[PDB]
Design a protein around this ligand. Structure first.
Ligand SMILES: O=[N+]([O-])c1ccc(O)cc1[N+](=O)[O-]
Ligand SMILES: O=[N+]([O-])c1ccc(O)cc1[N+](=O)[O-]
Ligand SMILES: [Cl-]
Ligand SMILES: [Cl-]
Ligand SMILES: [Mg+2]
Ligand SMILES: [Mg+2]
Ligand SMILES: [Mg+2]
Ligand SMILES: [Mg+2]
Lengths: 127, 127
C-alpha cells in the first residue's frame, strides 16, 4: 500500500493491538519499517531497527501472560499518523496488574510503522 | 514552576480539559507559552502565539455550548510531556454531536504548554 489514509491508519493501529494481545511477536515486528524507531516510554532514547524492536517485544510479551485492548477509538490523521489509548494487562511477581498507554505512530509510504512513541509513566501502572 | 514532573503534567493536562469544559477562554490561553504552537488536527500547519491560540479557542468555544471530558487517564512522561484521550460534545446545526480526540502536549520549563497536537479526523465525529 501507500501512505495509509485515516481509515487505513485506524485499521493498522487496531491490528497492531490485536497482534500484541495474542502475542504474535513475529507478526508485530513485520508491521514496522525495517529501520523503524520505538520510544518506550516516551522520554527515553529510541531503539532502532527490526531486530531491536523484536528484542523489545520478546522481552515484553514472551514471559508471563499479556493482554492488550483499546480503551477508546483510534484517532487518525490525513498524513499517515495516529494515536490510540489502550490498556495492557499483565502479571507482576504473579499478581494482576495493568498499564494504561497511549501510542502515537507515524506510518511510511508503504503502510509500515516508521515511528512509535508509547506515552506512559509509573502511575499508569496499577496492581 | 519548572519543567513539570509526570504528576504535574497529569494535573496540568486535566486542568486544561476542565477549562475547556467550562469555556474559560482567557484561562485556557494563559496555560500556553506566549509563543506556543497548536496543530489542530494533527496534520495541519501549526498556529503560533497566544493571540492566534485565543482566536482558535474563541472560534471553538464561544459559539454553541461545548463540553469536554477525559475518557481515560493522562499518560505523562518524565520529560514534561503527556498525552490524553477525551471527548468534546457540541452541537451541529442544533443537533448533539461528539468528537473523540487525543491531545499530545509538551510543557516548557515554566509549566506552560509549548506545543499541543490534537489527533482526530472526521470519523471521530459522531452525531
Ligand atoms: O510497555 N510496553 O511494553 C508496551 C508499550 C507500548 C506498546 O504498544 C506495547 C507494549 N508491550 O508490548 O508491552
Ligand atoms: O477540535 N477542537 O476544537 C479542539 C481540539 C483539541 C482541544 O484540546 C480542544 C479543542 N476545542 O477547544 O474544541
Ligand atoms: Cl477514548
Ligand atoms: Cl483510557
Ligand atoms: Mg485479541
Ligand atoms: Mg523506508
Ligand atoms: Mg467541568
Ligand atoms: Mg519561552
Amino acid at each position: 500500500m501507500n501512505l495509509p489514509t485515516a481509515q487505513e491508519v485506524q485499521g493498522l493501529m487496531a491490528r497492531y493491538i490485536e497482534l500484541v494481545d495474542v502475542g504474535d511477536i513475529e507478526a508485530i515486528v513485520q508491521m514496522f519499517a525495517d529501520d523503524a524507531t520505538v520510544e518506550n516510554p516516551f522520554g527515553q532514547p529510541p531503539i532502532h531497527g527490526r531486530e531491536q524492536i523484536a528484542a523489545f517485544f520478546r522481552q515484553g510479551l514472551g514471559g508471563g501472560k499479556v493482554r492488550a485492548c483499546l480503551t477508546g477509538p483510534v484517532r487518525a490523521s490525513h498524513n499517515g499518523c495516529g494515536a490510540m489509548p489502550f490498556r495492557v494487562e499483565m502479571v507482576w511477581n504473579g499478581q494482576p496488574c495493568a498499564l494504561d498507554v497511549i501510542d502515537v505512530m507515524r506510518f511510511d509510504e508503504h503502510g509500515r510503522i516508521q515511528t512509535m512513541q508509547a506515552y506512559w509513566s509509573e502511575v499508569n501502572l496499577s496492581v
